[PDB]
Structure formats: C-alpha cells, structure tokens
From a paper:
CGS is a transferase and acts in the committed step (the fifth overall) of the biosynthesis of l-methionine. MetB is covalently linked to the cofactor pyridoxal phosphate (PLP), similar to other members of the aspartate aminotransferase (AAT-I) superfamily of enzymes. Similar to other CGS enzymes, MetB forms a homotetramer, with each individual homodimer creating two active sites.
The crystal structure of CGS from M. ulcerans is presented covalently linked to the cofactor pyridoxal phosphate (PLP). Covalently bound at the intersection between the two monomers is the PLP-Lys208 moiety. PLP binds tightly to Lys208 with a covalent-bond length ranging between 1.3 and 1.4 Å. A similar series of sulfates are found in the MetB–PLP structure; however, there is no evidence for the presence of HEPES or any other ligand bound in the four active sites. The only noted change is seen in a loop consisting of residues 350–362, in which the disordered loop in the MetB–PLP structure becomes partially ordered in the MetB–PLP–HEPES structure. 4-succinyl-l-homoserine, l-cysteine, l-cystathionine, succinate and combinations of products and reactants proved unsuccessful, showing only the presence of the PLP covalently bound in the active site.
Author numbering:
A (entry chain C): 12 to 350, 362 to 388
B (entry chain D): 11 to 352, 357 to 387
C (entry chain A): 12 to 352, 355 to 388
D (entry chain B): 10 to 351, 357 to 388
The structure:
C-alpha cells in the first residue's frame, strides 16, 4: 500500500529456491536453456533481459504506480531512448526553456542533426506551450521543478494540451522523485528518471529509467533498450534498488533541511533571491503545492554581489561539497553557469544535521 | 610493455601513486569534488562524462589494439550505435556484411532505416562486390571477420583500400578474433569495435562494448555520444572487463587449440556434413584468414547430415557444452542459430550448430560431442 | 559536528587525485612499493590494511567518538577478536544471562575448551554483577538492550565496577547502534557492533566492528585482525559505509514505527506482554532513558495463546518477513525459542515470544499487517 | 562436471540456475533468507554467516578441484589456518611445523597460540627422520607446506602422511604454492588441505580469501562450527572473484611454470646470481620428491645475489615489469626481498630475492630482469 512499503517489498520477492531477501546480483551475460522447453524464466541474454534488472524495473514501475518500467545505464540513455522511440525525422518536440543541460545538448546538438526540430517554451505559461505545438509536434518534454531554476510546470495542464493535439507528454521527475510527484496520475504518458540522483541517493551509481502505463510505448522502449544496449550492469542495478528502499525517508529529510536552508538564505543579506518551490513568493508555488507531496531538497540562490560572490560561496563551504550532480545524502553545491544567470548558486541539500549545514553556509558567506 | 600479454596486464593502469594499489580501484562515485569552480581533480567532473575506472579500461582496450584512443560502452550494441551515429547522418549509406551479427543487422535495418540511413548487404569476401556496393553517399563500410555463425572471412586490408578510394571509413567488428588474434588498425581499418561481453571479458559475466581508433577526430565524435547519450559502463563491470582482458592472450591460445581439435573430430564424424572453421585449408577464405589472423579462434560451426532434427538433438544432449546464447567464454557453449536467434541477409541453415569452444580439457569436450552425437 | 554529518563526512575525505566523493572499492590484495619498504600511504598487504577498510574504520570510529576502529568479516569475528585480545587461559568473563545466542555459543562451546571461565548474571542487578567478579575476571561482557528480551544494563554503572576491579568493559552496541547510545562516553573500554544489522541497514553485508579509545587495546585487536585474518572484503566494507550514511535517519524512523507497533500490540487481546524499552512499565526504562537518545526498532511480544499462536503470527505476516537477523529497512519477524540451543547458563527464551524488527515501511501498513495476521 | 581438472574447475562448483539458467553463481548479497513457517527453510539457507548460496558454490568448486568431499571458505588464508589449528588442537597439544614456514603461519602459531598453551617444534620437513623425532605423545598435528615460502624447499607428503598415521596425528598441507592444478595432497594421504585463495586460485591479486578441504566429514563439521562460530567468512562478491579466478587456474599455472622455468634458466647463467632455487632444476634439493608429487614445478623462483643485500634491494627497485609488492600467484609478475618484507625459524638470507613469475610474454620478463640486473 504505502509508497515506502512498496519501495521495499514490491519489485523483488524473496527467492523461492533460497529465500534471499534481496535481489541477487546476477553477473551472468547468458543463461542455460533446455533443449525441449527453451528458456528458463524467459531469460536468454543479459542485454535483452536479466534477473537483477527485472527486479529494478519492477520496483521503479511500482513507486510510480506504472504498469511498465525500463532501466538504462544513465538518465541520458533513458532520454535518448525516449526521443528515439517517440520521434522520427520530420518531427518536432516542445522543450522547457530552462531544461537540464544534458537534455538540451542532446536535442540541440544531436537530434537536430537527425532532422528533429524543437521549440523551447516557458512551461509555466500554458498558452505559450500550446502556441509552440505544430502539426509535427509528437512530444512535449516536461521538467518540474526545473534544473536549476526550480520553475514549475502544471503537468495536468500540459497533458491536456498533449491530448488535444496528439502529442505525448514525458515528464522528467528526477528532482521531485517518485516520493514527491507521480506524473502518470496527472496525465503524463511517460516518466523519466536519472536514478543517479535521488533514487540511488548516494552518488555511487549512474543509471536511468523510463516508466509508463502504455504497453506499446513500453515495447518501443524495450526495442531500443535491447537494440542499442544502453543497459545497466547488475551491481549498479542492485545499488539503485538499494537506494530506492530509503527514498521516501530520505526525501522527507531533504525537504525539511531545504526549507530550513531557504529560510536562512531568505534572511541573509548576501543573497538577493531564493529559489525554492516551498516559498509562497516562488513563482509556481501554487502549482507545486497542488502536484507535489513535498517541496524537494534543492535550493538555488542568486547572489547579491554577482558571479564572484557565487564562486567564493562555492569554494568556501566545508560540508557542502563543490561537485556536479545532486540528490545525495551529502550536500553538494555548484555554480551552474560555469559547470543561467552567473550569480546563481545551486544547493543540493543533503540529510546532514541542519545546524551544521546552516553554520557551514554562515561561515562560507562571511 | 612490448608483447601483447604484457600490455594487456600492465598498459591500462599503473599502480596508484597514493596507495600502490596494483588493480584499478572500483570508483563507485558519480561525481567528484572540485577545488574552486572548475578546479578539477585529474580532469574528473561527472562519472558519465569520464571516470577513473572506465579511463583505466579504455587505456587497456586501446593498448591491446595498439590504438591511440579507446571508448568503453555499456554493451557491444551500444558501441555499434555510437559508431553508426558518429559516422552517419540521414541521407548516408553504409555497406554491411550479408551475414552480419544479428543485433547489428537488426539495429541498422529496423532502427536506422527509419532515420533515413540506407544500407546494402554484400559478400565481403568478394572485393568487386564490395566495391560495387559503394555509392556517392556511402560513408561507412562495416566489416566483421570471421562472421557469425558461418565464420566467413573478409580481407580487412583489401576493404580498407576500397574505403580510402571512395572516402568511406572502415569499421571492423573484431569481437570473434579479439585483439589476441587480429589487429585491424594495422591493416588499415579506421575503427575497431568489440563486444567485450565475449572473449575480452571471457567469463560470461559482464556486458560491455568498446571502440578504438587512432583518429583523434573520430574519437572526439564518439566521446560526444558517449557522454551525450550515456550508454556507459559501470565501474564494477569495467573492472570485470579489465580483469577478463588480463588472460585474453592465454585463453585464446587454448581456445584455438581446443577448437582445432573439435573441428578435426567433427570432420571425421559420420553425422557431420560440413565443418566451418578458419583453420581448415578447405574453409573458404582460409588463406585470407592465415594472412590476417595470428590463430584461428575458438568458434566452430557444423552442419548436421541428418538435418534440423539432428541439430536439435545434439544441442539438447551435450553435458559440458552449455546450451545457451553468447560465445567467448571459458565454459564451452552450444547454439542452434535457426531456433535460438531471430531478403536482406543470408538464411542460416536450420541444420547448423554453432560451438563456442572453451578452455576445458579437450578429452572431455570430445567425449561430450561423441556421446551427444 | 552532528552525528548524521559525521556518518557522512568524517571517515573518507574526497580523493585528492580524482575528487571521488565516495571511498573507492580497492580490490587489490597487494600494493606497489618504491624500492624495498618504500610504502605508499602505508599500504603493503590487504589483510594487514587496505584503503577501503581504512575508510570504514575511520567512519566507525567517528560515529562512536572513538579514536580507534577495526572492521571484521562479521560481528562474531569482532567478538572472537575481542575475547582473544583480552583473555587468556585461566581468565574469566562475566556475561549477560540473556546474551545474544551467538556470543553465548562462542564462549560456552569454544572458549571453555581453551580454559576460559564465565559466569552469567542479570546485568540489571549491579550488586550481582559485582558478586560475579573473581580475581581472574578480566572482562565484563555487556549487551543492552539484549537479544531478544530487550533487558537494560546500566553501562556507566558496570563501567564503574570494571574500574574498581581492573576488568575491561565491552558493550555490544548492536541493537541500539551509535545513533542511540554511546557506550565509550559512559565508561565502556570497547564497543562492539554487528554491522550486519542496523549499521549496514539493508540485510546485504555481513560485518563486525570493535571501536575503542585505548591505543594499546586497539593494537591487541590489530594483531588478531591481521594474524587470524577475519577481515571484510572491500565491496562489503563499502556497503557498510553506505548504510552508515543513513543510520541516524533510519533509527529515528525504526524507533517511531516501533513505538507505534508496541502501543498497538499492548492493546491487542492476543498479546499478554510487550517488551519495548520505551514503555514506562518496561523494566529498565529509566536506565534506558538515561543512556539512549531513542528506544530502538525492536519490539518482542508474548502471545496469550502460547507457542502455536507465536508460530501462527510468524507464518501469517505478509509484510514482516519471517527470517533471522534484524535492523533492516524491511520488517523481520521471528520465533526465537526455535533458534535457541543453554539450560542452566542462560535464561530460557519463552516459547510464546515473537521478536519483531520493525522496519521503515509505512506504519499504517505494518499495523494492518499485524492486525490481519493476529486475527 | 566433471573429468579433467580444468573441466571441473569450470563446471563442478555451480550448475546453471534452474529458475533463470544463469551460467555463473549469482552474487547473493543477503544476510538472511525468508522461511515458510518457522524453520521452514528454503534450500536449507537461514543466515548468511552460517551458509549462503554464493559461498556454497565456491566451497563446491574448491572441494571438486582437490577431489575432496568437503570444502570450507574463509575471509583469508590466515583465517583458514586459524580455523584448522583451533579445530584440531586444544591447550596442552603440540604441532610439528616447517622450519621455514610462511611468515603469517609462524607468527600465528608462535605469537598467538603459544599463549593459549599449544606448543610446537619446527623441523626440516625434507628429513623424515627428523619429522618423526619431533613428534610427542601430545602431537596432534603436523603442519606441511611444500614448496615452502620463500626457499621453495620440498616435503614428501606421502612419507609425512605415514608418520602422522603411525602416531595418530592429522596432517595438513598448505597447498597455496603448488595449487590444485599441480599438487593433490589428499591423494597422497593428507587429512586436510589449506589454501590462501588470495594467491593462485583467485589469480589476480584482487580478492583475499582462504579454504580448507577434507574427506573427513567429522573434521569438516569441526571446521563448520568455527566458520560459523567465529565468523571469518567471505563476502559473496569476493567468493565470486575467487570462483572466477579458479576457472583459469589450470591454464594460468601451465604458463606460470613455463615462464618461471625460463626465468630460472636465465638467472642460473647470469653472473649476478649465485644460487637459483626452483623445484624444476635437477640440482634443487628435493627435486625428485617434487617430480614425484607435483604435475609441474610452479611459478615461484627465488635467487641469491652474489653482491649481497644491496644488489637484492637494487634488483627489486629496478624492475619495470615485475612489480615490487608482497603477495604472489598473480597474472602480473611480482618481486620482493623477503628478509625485509615477507632461533625458532630458518633465517631467510638477506641476499635473497623472491620472484613470483606471472603470465606476461617471457621475452619481456627476461629483458626486464637483464636491464634490472645491469
Ligand atoms: Na546487512
């Protein structure tokens, strides 16, 4: 029933042969068959399907209340599979005007070379999103909150627009995670995760996922999953599943720490603007409150005194680690314009003691 | 650093300065602390883009192909996908084998054709036919030798020259021969692909692929899609692949010796009509194979005189050869391609059985085949 | 500063060479040297010491405010090191009368063979613990809360006894974990963990730990760690470090869930007694409140209808998993009398008793699960 | 499954999974196992320390390769050793040991077990009269290594087996150096065999582990008790690497022997070297015993340096392919100076260099030594 219970129990059942409570790590690329009966348990070749990956996919689908899940070697590999499944030459995709840099690079630098067209739009503006839809638009790419601005898109709003013009709607739910948002229950066709971030939760596994309720779409994902082979190894799939078992607990403490950080930096005179979906003054706050169970562990701030203040905050923290990525138990900090306005610093607030995080920020700010 | 066994062990990772660790550590870190914004440690910033275990692996792979550049991927097919997309755009054409690896044929035909890439399959053994397949739009010639499962041979130098002459790149998928038996960059290939799943890993426990090249520009174009599409290996698997590669040379020698003994036995056996093995003087392309390969490999295929039934029975009744997909493993494997794999390619005969001969004691392998037959 | 912060940051600093934020898994048994004995970072052979294990030891030490940490292949291996380091033939150990079955079996079955004597005692009775001390008593073996009865021992109180008689005091701090109890701040000489339980947290790594401030005792431990070689591999060490990083967060939820499960069972008519340190009426509650930051994730209950009802509860849960071990994110249930061997030297585990390791699943679910399972 | 040793090492430890057909033993990272009703075990598994599926597969593999009925794996060679000694000895008992034992074995016996009132006597194992004369009424164990570290001296396993039978004393052989691929001590009357699987069996210097195998079901049960009771148990990833390494043991050992024989030949002709120790050399003390009981003469060569301790140090410093590091039995060549690295034991001469010859191309290893010797 509950999501924490599902993250722990839903996708791997203790083995019949040994009772092993955890999905074993099947470091096998191939599988014995029976000359009369053929495959055992449907397994033939690891790329196509393997037991550990099946467990992961079953858990990923479970926590998004999806019928189907697919796991990939990276969040970008999931995005690549989604783009390639749902677009062809001559098609168009609407994208966010502030999407994840890797997504933008992929679409602008790769897919445009393969005769896919795209228009970025401020997703908060539903009339703007609708105007950006052409006869050739097959796909609407939604991110919410966005990386790094934490801007909000009305998933339900956009799904309606998708339905109205026969465009599919994908929601990249990395930041929010299954613990905070369920885009399928709001109308999305497909949900994408970089499991590298919150689901893994420990900065130790690169991975990705696609989940959906649409069986034809799942089969189209599977075709590219097997065919172009951007698939996770079993130790990594195991680590991902491991992380997922604590996601709900973790995202609660991320969100509580992140509110405390945003409140501190709201009052701190070096900071001009705090970007956090929990704040009533944040644009999109109301939309966030309706579609999110909690407001996430991400906080971005714009520094009063500009780029140089931003660089110096990033270099002076002793708990927040200056590094790319986000969604880890250890707080991370970066300067996105370098690594977006150049005075913006992005904070992935971890699960450390809050008094420590607030003291680290105070001393770093001077 | 001079011989290939030596390089395979020593070239890919030097013992750590800070600890002296003799093996590449498994860096299960997705990200990497910086000193000031963009003050990278050792060039590392985000594991998809680059990471220390995968760098070690890429060094080892480049070294055993005597290549300046190596790229590792989550699978052989991810390596194929990256190459195709790096070297082709809509409108372009690729010459491929008429008996290509099935996953390669499926990707080009069922995926890339819908991205306005065109192809022509050819008997690669016939250089006039290969030449005649090249269009003004041909940017790529895709070579596999030996091919799967007929073990047909292509003249990698002869095909390099046809590529040079029409400004098409030549990729050689060297999975079957491995770096131990065949070095296609030395013969004029632009790029070599492996499935490291097979012989390089050698133990049927890590899926992975590789691209290697001496062309800096081409390496940069693969890097772009490596990072961009993120079909990247994890560090445990990258480690397994490297560990696998440290015995490649030794394993392949025993693989070839065992395969030659199996080929010999099956050539004398009443139930077999045809033995396909690159080392037999009567194998088509044997003399090419002899010129470009150091040994003739661990794959043997046969056609059963009594047809599909005989082939099915053999695969069912082995007790040491394992009925399974894949090849290149220390344990012998057996497949009936017509039953176990899925106009434009050659039809694999339904009386054909493919043997991946492993490193077991040869007497036991021969006795297994004898009783199975 | 804060313990959750320390669990995250204290025992591995991001790598100078690469910045890697996590302790790399160094699968190397050996280490290159710069001319003979020119060691690199002090490494020479994995069993003696290796980088991943050093990181784990540094984390383990940090979370208990200990200067020294040593990791082993299991909690039992940590226990065997501790006993072999601190005892010799003819020495004696005072032990809990309801100790963890593995500790008792190792002492009663193996060490008695090697001429070490023991006396079990009710650790809650400080006069009885003191009475059990002989001139040959070199060690007092404290466990709190106990497995499976959850009895409480006054650590500071026992530590004073050890000091008075020159006997070292070890606390098996497994159940409580570092998040809830800090025995070295209370006078223990050594703290033991099975990191197989709460610290790993995910039932996926078997491991043990001995932490201490006494550099001489740590060197005795190191001698046996190296010499008898019950050492963890580096993937396992990494998993244990990984679990540790969310211990503080998880223990909080185990303790909340467990409070709820205990109150629930306490009013259920199938249950005759609830054993939970948090309950005011639990013997040792005031002692536990003094020394523990929270009351833990374990609850044991006695069934009004006897052994058969206990077996039927264990068989009927669909969320609690019927399996040994404890301190996992998944709720585990068991019937401990069925794994006990003891008569006369250890308290009898009642056959109507069910032990529950309450996980971090949604509490409503877990209560629904007990409710349907009880009938 | 089943005939030749290379076949067994591949096929005997795990049959492909009935549920999935997985060709390799899965890594079961589970400390516990669900039951069907209380005591209703699945496959007999209940708690990983006591038994777990990946360890079971490794123990089957280890047993099969020594033609043993019973296998036990441990977290290191030294944990295998500590288990053996605690299983077979009690205070007041005595063990006869080699006078040039592996340094860890000697340290555990002399520095740990003497304090638990176990006594020992070191003896030249090659001299069967001296082994015999070392045996007391309290002698319950004779501890045999052959070849010995690092002098590569030989002991007559069968002959020492008969001395043990004569005096009701169990015989254990540390078969680490020879490995199952070259020496089968149970076939020669040993009661138990021990390995550091860290060395040849794993092969790749990437997994610490040990093993005890036996045909004696009673002995196995005494080891099981302490495996479980003391818990020096391997993790399942490490167990997996050990099983994977074992899959190429027979193949690697053949090369290691060929490479080492050539390294011995080269060194014997080289004027910087006064003595070459290699079991395969006709003039090696114990060569005909070694020829009798070993299928090949192994990967280890030790040499003494004419110019003494300093030339030993210099050779160890100057190799570029042989890596200066402890341990042995790796696909990469290793070199060490045991007197610096590693009256109750034979002094290892300070001029001695121990070479663990790997599977690199022989011509590169000879060139490496030739340039390092100057
Ligand atoms: Na665990």
């Amino acid at each position: 029933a509950g999501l924490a219970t599902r993250a722990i129990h839903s996708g791997y059942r203790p083995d019949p042969a040994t009772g092993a409570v955890n999905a074993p790590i099947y470091a096998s690329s191939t599988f014995a068959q029976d000359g009369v009966g053929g495959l055992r348990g449907g397994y033939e070749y690891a790329r196509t399907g393997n037991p550990t990956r099946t467990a992961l996919e079953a858990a990923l689908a479970a926590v998004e209340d999806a019928a189907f899940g697919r796991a990939f070697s990276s969040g970008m590999a999931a995005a690549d599979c989604a783009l390639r499944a749902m677009l062809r030459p001559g098609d168009h995709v609407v994208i966010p005007d502030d999407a994840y840099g890797g997504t933008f690079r992929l679409i602008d630098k790769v897919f445009t070379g393969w005769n896919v067209e795209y228009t970025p739009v401020a997703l908060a503006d539903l009339d703007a999103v609708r105007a950006a839809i052409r006869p050739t638009t097959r796909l609407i790419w939604v991110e919410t909150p966005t990386n790094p601005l934490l801007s909000i898109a009305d998933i339900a709003g956009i799904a309606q627009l998708g339905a109205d013009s026969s465009a599919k709607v994908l929601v990249d739910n990395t930041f929010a995670s299954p613990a905070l948002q369920q885009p399928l229950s709001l109308g999305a066709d497909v949900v994408l995760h970089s499991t590298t971030k919150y689901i893994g939760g420990h900065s130790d596994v690169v991975g990705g996922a696609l989940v959906t309720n649409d069986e034809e779409l799942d089969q189209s994902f599977a075709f590219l999953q097997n065919g172009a082979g951007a698939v996770p190894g079993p130790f990594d799939a195991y680590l991902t599943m491991r992380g997922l078992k604590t996601l709900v607990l973790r995202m609660q403490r991320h969100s509580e720490n992140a509110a405390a950080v945003a409140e501190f930096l709201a009052e701190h005179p070096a900071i001009s603007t705090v970007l956090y979906p929990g704040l009533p003054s944040h644009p999109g706050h109301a939309v966030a409150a309706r579609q999110m169970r909690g407001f996430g562990g991400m906080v971005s701030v714009r520094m009063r005194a500009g780029r140089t203040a931003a660089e110096q905050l990033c270099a002076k923290t002793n708990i927040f680690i200056l590094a790319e990525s986000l969604g880890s138990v250890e707080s991370l900090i970066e300067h996105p314009s370098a690594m977006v306005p150049d005075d913006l610093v992005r904070l992935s607030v971890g699960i450390e003691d809050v008094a420590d995080l607030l003291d680290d920020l105070k001393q770093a700010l001077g």
